[PDB]
Design an enzyme around this catalytic site. Structure first.
Site, PDB file in Angstrom:
ATOM      1  N   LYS B 177      11.713  13.708 -18.925  1.00  0.00           N
ATOM      2  CA  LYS B 177      11.948  12.944 -17.703  1.00  0.00           C
ATOM      3  C   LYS B 177      13.061  13.617 -16.867  1.00  0.00           C
ATOM      4  CE  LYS B 177       9.019   9.729 -18.953  1.00  0.00           C
ATOM      5  NZ  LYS B 177       7.607   9.959 -18.551  1.00  0.00           N
ATOM      6  N   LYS B 203       6.973  16.260 -25.030  1.00  0.00           N
ATOM      7  CA  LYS B 203       5.802  16.593 -24.237  1.00  0.00           C
ATOM      8  C   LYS B 203       6.136  16.779 -22.802  1.00  0.00           C
ATOM      9  CE  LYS B 203       2.621  13.346 -23.413  1.00  0.00           C
ATOM     10  NZ  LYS B 203       2.946  13.229 -22.005  1.00  0.00           N
ATOM     11  N   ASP B 205       5.079  15.741 -19.167  1.00  0.00           N
ATOM     12  CA  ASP B 205       4.520  14.534 -18.616  1.00  0.00           C
ATOM     13  C   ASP B 205       3.069  14.866 -18.204  1.00  0.00           C
ATOM     14  OD1 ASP B 205       6.616  12.078 -17.154  1.00  0.00           O
ATOM     15  OD2 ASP B 205       4.506  11.888 -17.641  1.00  0.00           O
ATOM     16  N   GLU B 206       2.181  13.865 -18.192  1.00  0.00           N
ATOM     17  CA  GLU B 206       0.745  14.085 -17.831  1.00  0.00           C
ATOM     18  C   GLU B 206       0.538  14.763 -16.469  1.00  0.00           C
ATOM     19  OE1 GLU B 206       2.226  10.858 -16.106  1.00  0.00           O
ATOM     20  OE2 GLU B 206       1.848  10.685 -18.246  1.00  0.00           O
ATOM     21  N   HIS B 295      -3.676  13.118 -23.592  1.00  0.00           N
ATOM     22  CA  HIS B 295      -3.089  12.032 -22.842  1.00  0.00           C
ATOM     23  C   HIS B 295      -4.248  11.324 -22.155  1.00  0.00           C
ATOM     24  CE1 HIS B 295      -1.338  10.037 -19.416  1.00  0.00           C
ATOM     25  NE2 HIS B 295      -0.247   9.944 -20.154  1.00  0.00           N
ATOM     26  N   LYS B 335       5.791  -1.012 -22.387  1.00  0.00           N
ATOM     27  CA  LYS B 335       5.500  -1.316 -20.963  1.00  0.00           C
ATOM     28  C   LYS B 335       4.022  -1.267 -20.532  1.00  0.00           C
ATOM     29  CE  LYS B 335       6.035   3.359 -19.224  1.00  0.00           C
ATOM     30  NZ  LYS B 335       6.992   4.326 -18.645  1.00  0.00           N
TER      31      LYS B 335
HETATM   32  O1  LIG Z   1       4.324   8.350 -18.111  1.00  0.00           O
HETATM   33  C1  LIG Z   1       4.931   7.586 -18.894  1.00  0.00           C
HETATM   34  O2  LIG Z   1       5.444   6.509 -18.506  1.00  0.00           O
HETATM   35  C2  LIG Z   1       4.992   8.057 -20.354  1.00  0.00           C
HETATM   36  O3  LIG Z   1       5.558   9.372 -20.327  1.00  0.00           O
HETATM   37  C3  LIG Z   1       5.934   7.245 -21.241  1.00  0.00           C
HETATM   38  O4  LIG Z   1       7.272   7.505 -20.850  1.00  0.00           O
HETATM   39  P1  LIG Z   1       8.468   6.619 -21.466  1.00  0.00           P
HETATM   40  O5  LIG Z   1       8.460   6.986 -22.921  1.00  0.00           O
HETATM   41  O6  LIG Z   1       9.658   7.070 -20.668  1.00  0.00           O
HETATM   42  O7  LIG Z   1       8.028   5.204 -21.191  1.00  0.00           O
HETATM   43  C4  LIG Z   1       3.559   8.109 -20.944  1.00  0.00           C
HETATM   44  O8  LIG Z   1       2.827   9.101 -20.220  1.00  0.00           O
HETATM   45  C5  LIG Z   1       2.823   6.754 -20.952  1.00  0.00           C
HETATM   46  O9  LIG Z   1       3.285   5.958 -22.045  1.00  0.00           O
HETATM   47  C6  LIG Z   1       1.336   6.853 -21.197  1.00  0.00           C
HETATM   48  O10 LIG Z   1       0.827   5.550 -21.467  1.00  0.00           O
HETATM   49  P2  LIG Z   1      -0.168   5.306 -22.696  1.00  0.00           P
HETATM   50  O11 LIG Z   1       0.647   5.836 -23.860  1.00  0.00           O
HETATM   51  O12 LIG Z   1      -0.448   3.828 -22.737  1.00  0.00           O
HETATM   52  O13 LIG Z   1      -1.417   6.062 -22.315  1.00  0.00           O
HETATM   53 MG   LIG Z   2       3.966  10.460 -18.910  1.00  0.00          MG
END
Ligand SMILES: O=C(O)[C@@](O)(COP(=O)(O)O)[C@H](O)[C@H](O)COP(=O)(O)O
Ligand SMILES: [Mg+2]
Ligand SMILES: O=C(O)[C@@](O)(COP(=O)(O)O)[C@H](O)[C@H](O)COP(=O)(O)O
Ligand SMILES: [Mg+2]
Ligand SMILES: [Mg+2]
Ligand SMILES: [Mg+2]
Lengths: 139, 482, 482, 240, 121, 121
Positions: B177, B203, B205-206, B295, B335
């Protein structure tokens, strides 16, 4: 440094009382324990030395602690670990592994860097203990 | 008079004209399911005045051999064999107008090894059908014979843990982040620190692919420096999911080949790349000894609501078939949308060798997995070490717990963030194994406070996010409670 | 005391802890949109007690740079620039709890030429967010600068008509039926007949890929024989959309290369292959002089409902960007969901050089198309020559009208099916151009009956499907009527 | 004294030494065949004084997971799953020394889409076993789930007939003779003649590949002149 | 193709066995013969004077690549020149081939590091 | 700065690839190679983790005179677009033409994220 392989190396070193309770957990789940020694702490050292066979038929936790203790009395300074093996279809693998003994002083590793093409780096992790001395006298 | 008129088909079934889909061979309550059939459970909401069996005969018809009017070319084929049969319609509990439709499709309707072909029949058109106001694909029974055409996971849970040399706890991770903005050099800083402090993975981020603020090669090289530095500093195998998601299959491969060339144990891909790019990179992962993290970007667009779309449990099956090694499958207490028992059902789909009807978890079909490997579930999204008792309870052992904000948000730095998560994790599991009633509201948090007296980073964390929950009315709920 | 405590950030924004997303830089009503921003319109349903501006600040936050808790690493980046700003929240007409959220994203957040990267930010996670009970992506304003990174259509409407040498009417087509079951040899029979009788195209059905009853090479070769036979018999350019949809990008290319090698003017792909396979094959189509027909398989899983998912008009934009030449975009009067004015808006998105705010058609943003070529809309699904007046009215000139059941269901054979459709089409357009009020319930059907006195196949067709309509309550409706 | 000795396995199944295959899990007459099992039928001729059920169990063991002596490494696998099962031993008509043995192999024993792996297990070693004086693989049940991994015919009967445009009779053919000696140009002569006179195909003899008397390229080019000549003479698809 | 092609299935003959063949020098010179051969093999191994030594890994099927690498390390370290995959160990659900190869290489090189001998599997 | 400048794009690429293979952090090219080669090797540098130094050889043939040619500031833009990492832009006090205000113009064109009207520069 602290070698943090094994799954309880972020807690303090486990007392025999604590070890028995994890061995008890493992055995009640039906799993097979073994005990292993190395003094090559490399992350890629897959095959530590077998302290005999795994204890397959064994029912009492105390038998495994008796073997851990015999490994401790007989093995040279290094690492010992206990592993739980699950031979069930779709597992057929280790499912728990923790360090039961570690040396008083682990010097650790350095990162050796060889220039590859462009900016790429051929890395090698090197052990202070293993480069200084052969098997059986590294700690 | 002319040859066309004299040769017209005059039979009931094959005279020209519309007849209802239930008369066309697409309904049979007495039909015995074969071991080789592909089965679908659809949640159908008929338009008012549409007969519920006709709605299911239509879906069955239009997902296999039928069109809207009668065609003589049916008689050039073995048409009785190729038709789907809707074979059971149940009302939904508490709906006087929503129904569960079970439909069997013949094995030979499907291209071997092809998610794309399966989904073309099964989801292609029937969700746009005017006769139906709503349609959710709820479960599928992929037969053993079709499953053996697919690779399944490239690596799988067993071999993954073998490559990491990490057994007995859940695996740990974190998303870097902020989501976007960071330079490649700074990405490597975050990864080093996160791994040095105790995390197994970080990781990308997506949405981190290649951009003006950081192009992908810089990330990859600086991250490998971070990774090996962390591995040398700890004596553990470490990694970071390098996002190889790109516009073209050619660019994906380029990024994946580069990740391999520099020794990355793992890569990640986003679901938005879509099924055919996913099957290719999953073959590529088996062939190049790579962990493949999926992801699930865009999943909740079709998966969130109860009335229409695809249930995520179906996506799990399809993604485990294709061959990804990790897939995000929820937190429960984070969340993002995650009803507890639905999530457990998802985790069971990803991790078991076969499945048994279990309606509270949404497991509508019994299903063998044909020794396709096990997919590692990933729990990411607004979770903190404070909730470790809950995560261990709901999620079990084989899972990656990821802590983005819950690592990097830590005031004392990222190392401390990481260390807090791992002590939390390890102390909690140790206590589970000792036989303590850890999921108790009293007991669990006290296990973390006990561990926190010898770990100041964890006391900091527990006190910082003590207050934080995400208690909201879940929309993807079960039809059968408890 | 320690270095960690002494260096902790003590500022309001960057002390550790959760703060609402509206305080984090993700809300600004006064924000002036730049020509270069990417804009999204979201239909948000907050969970009860969630502040509607906080719901939009969250979506904006979590689709750009934010996570759930505060991160110091924001300060290593130009964080003020990279944050999305939600900049307007309107209530939906007739909802006291559903809102329209406009959010601006900076151009530099997006990988050039990458649908996958755009959709990772924009749809990745925010639809699974617990704070929101429902979320629909309704429109997007893709800025001129981002558009110029994309190819747009491989061929496009102008060049397509130039390759066919066919101008002044809509183009014609049909899906081969039954959907599955047919052998390659029999596929070529249906294609020959359909083309000989007058159709410009036929197509493989979306689920026709390669299967035990017919493997793809047999289809391709027998169909080229059919195609050229039809072209030699009429003196027109003819084709059939050869489905190259496959499991892997390697198999797609193999099929696409083979289609080219044997002279197919066109290929088709299914949307289920997914965005990255689609961008690759769209580049491949420009480079290999091929028409690229996109069937929209699986679209209605996320697109059907009003409350949640992605509106199809957005998919149109994304698919025209990627570079497909045809895309199915509805009938209005056929068997699949198609509200009249929404469909017109879709057709406008696919066919115009720029867009002007037009709320009845669902066009929420004004948008230049950067001279990206025009995508040909395709109207398929339960339509017959009886409804030609309606289709010409609702759909205009640049469109492929497809008649699967409405060709092959014809009693006198497939040639007669085809001929009926073309006489219908041509007689109707001739009358539009003459200035007749053809969309009138009286006038239109009589134009087809007049034409039918010199065409017995068309009188047969009009009398066979006179009765047939698909009048059902549409679910994808507009918020602003007329 | 030693860890080796204290940890020696002491069970009836996994103590070291030789026990009959029939007691190692490879004989089970009550076993219910799954539709996913691979099955084999063998005509086993056991050596004089060898038990028929023991020989069937040996064939099952040595074509699945067994060796002649017990191994502790069995316990690192789900060893009960992978063991083949002789599930039926029946006498053969008009013989009291030869038996039919039905064996069952778990689907997971075989590499997908590999004849070489199937035949490594099923035929690899067991035919050369001293305990059995003869052995014949008579038939197999290749389960639906294994077959879907294989291609099956490239073309098939149906599509072949479509490509040739011949339906209603058997197809016709001839091997070109003498077996060896002909030049490519004469080969193509014979091919032209027999196709023109009515054959659908001719063929190279099995031992015609490429030799001093005729190299393969001269045969192929001359044959295509013959084939196409016959095709133009007849209005038929032809080949060799 | 010539020598065993058809003749064993001929009706006029109730049984037929090819017992031996004289492959003439001239035909033999068209063939490679062993890739390495006994002499060069021993040279690459640095082992002359005693028969060489091996073991097939067991059980035949079911072992994971990990455990295969274990058996190979143990056997080689104890004195064996070689271990081998079983004939029917190719690549199967229980163990895919790349895992076996990588894990055996670790085992092999560990054995040779422990003994100062060229080892293999 | 290893100069990969050559007659043919085929030779530039050999020399680029060699330089990468031997570990060089940077290569140089000459402007006389011309725009199509430049854009090609600038894509190459990105792909191959290489600094690309652009010597501006021949620039002064059209850039020297006030009345006629192309001001070098345009060349800075074009070359920044193509993707060279270095370009020679002047010394002021050295041996090659360089009025101070024009140089600072060029340096801003090369280095700033945005430009604003500045007539003296
Ligand atoms: O983009 C985000 O918010 C995250 O990096 C979580 O960050 P935090 O750890 O800072 O919350 C993940 O990509 C989501 O959790 C994906 O959701 P899921 O796992 O439900 O597909
Ligand atoms: Mg993410
Ligand atoms: O599968 C079918 O039913 C069709 O072949 C139409 O056949 P008929 O012409 O026989 O109806 C088309 O694939 C659908 O129209 C696609 O829907 P859309 O165009 O809305 O994506
Ligand atoms: Mg169709
Ligand atoms: Mg012969
Ligand atoms: Mg063997």
């Amino acid at each position: 440094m602290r070698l943090t392989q094994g799954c309880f190396s972020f807690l303090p070193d486990l007392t025999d009382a604590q070890i028995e309770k994890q061995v008890a957990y493992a055995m009640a789940k039906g799993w097979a324990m073994n005990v292993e020694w190395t003094d090559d702490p490399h992350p890629r050292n897959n095959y530590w030395e077998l302290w005999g066979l795994p204890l397959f038929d064994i029912k009492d936790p105390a038998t495994v602690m008796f073997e851990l203790n015999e490994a401790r009395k007989s093995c040279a300074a290094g690492y010992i670990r206990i592993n739980a093996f699950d031979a069930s279809y779709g597992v057929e693998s280790c499912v728990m592994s923790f360090i039961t003994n570690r040396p008083t002083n682990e010097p650790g590793f350095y990162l050796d860097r060889t220039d590859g093409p462009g900016r790429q780096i051929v890395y090698s992790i090197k052990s202070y203990s293993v480069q200084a001395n052969p098997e059986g006298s590294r700690y | 008079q002319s040859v066309s008129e004299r040769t017209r088909i005059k039979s009931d079934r094959y005279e020209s004209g519309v007849i209802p889909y239930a008369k066309m061979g697409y309904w049979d309550a007495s039909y015995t399911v074969k071991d080789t059939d592909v089965l679908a459970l659809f949640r159908i909401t008929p338009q008012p005045g549409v007969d519920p069996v006709e709605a299911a005969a239509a879906v069955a018809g239009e997902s296999s051999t039928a069109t809207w009017t009668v065609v003589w070319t049916d008689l050039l084929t073995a048409c009785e064999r190729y038709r789907a049969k809707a074979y059971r319609v149940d009302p939904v509990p508490n709906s006087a107008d929503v129904f569960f439709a079970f439909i069997a499709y013949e094995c030979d309707l499907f291209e071997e090894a092809s998610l794309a072909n399966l989904t073309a029949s099964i989801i292609g058109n029937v969700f746009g059908f005017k006769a139906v106001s709503a349609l959710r694909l709820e479960d599928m029974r992929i037969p053993h014979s079709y499953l053996x055409t697919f690779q399944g996971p490239a690596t799988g849970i067993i071999v993954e843990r073998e490559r990491l040399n990490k057994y007995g706890t859940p695996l740990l991770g974190a998303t870097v982040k902020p989501k976007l903005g960071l330079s490649g050099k700074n990405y490597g800083r975050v990864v080093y620190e996160g791994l040095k402090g105790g995390l197994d993975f970080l990781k990308d981020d997506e949405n981190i692919n290649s951009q003006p603020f950081m192009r992908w090669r810089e990330r990859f090289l600086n991250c490998m420096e971070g990774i090996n530095r962390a591995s040398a500093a700890t004596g553990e195998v470490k990694g970071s999911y390098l996002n190889i998601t790109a516009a073209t299959m050619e660019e994906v491969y380029k990024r994946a080949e580069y990740a391999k060339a520099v020794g990355s144990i793992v890569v990640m891909i986003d679901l938005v790349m879509g099924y055919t790019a996913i099957q290719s990179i999953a073959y590529w992962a088996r062939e190049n000894d790579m962990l493949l993290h999926l992801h699930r970007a865009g999943n909740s667009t079709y998966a969130r609501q109860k009335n229409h779309g695809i249930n995520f449990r179906v996506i799990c099956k399809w993604m485990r078939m294709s061959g990804v090694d990790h897939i995000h499958a929820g937190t429960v207490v984070g969340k993002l949308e995650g009803d507890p028992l639905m999530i457990k059902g998802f985790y069971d789909i990803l991790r078991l060798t076969e499945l048994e009807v279990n309606l509270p978890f949404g497991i509508f079909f019994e299903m063998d997995w044909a020794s396709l490997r096990r997919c590692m579930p990933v729990a990411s999204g607004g979770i903190h070490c404070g909730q470790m008792h809950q995560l261990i309870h709901y999620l079990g052992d084989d899972v990656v717990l990821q802590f983005g904000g819950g690592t990097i948000g830590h005031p004392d730095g990222i190392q401390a963030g990481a260390t807090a998560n791992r002590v939390a994790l390890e102390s909690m599991v140790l206590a589970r194994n000792e036989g303590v009633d850890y999921f108790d509201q009293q007991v669990g948090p006290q296990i973390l406070r006990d561990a926190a007296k010898t770990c100041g980073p964890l006391q900091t964390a527990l006190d910082l996010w003590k207050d934080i929950s995400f208690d909201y009315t879940s929309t993807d709920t079960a039809d059968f409670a408890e």
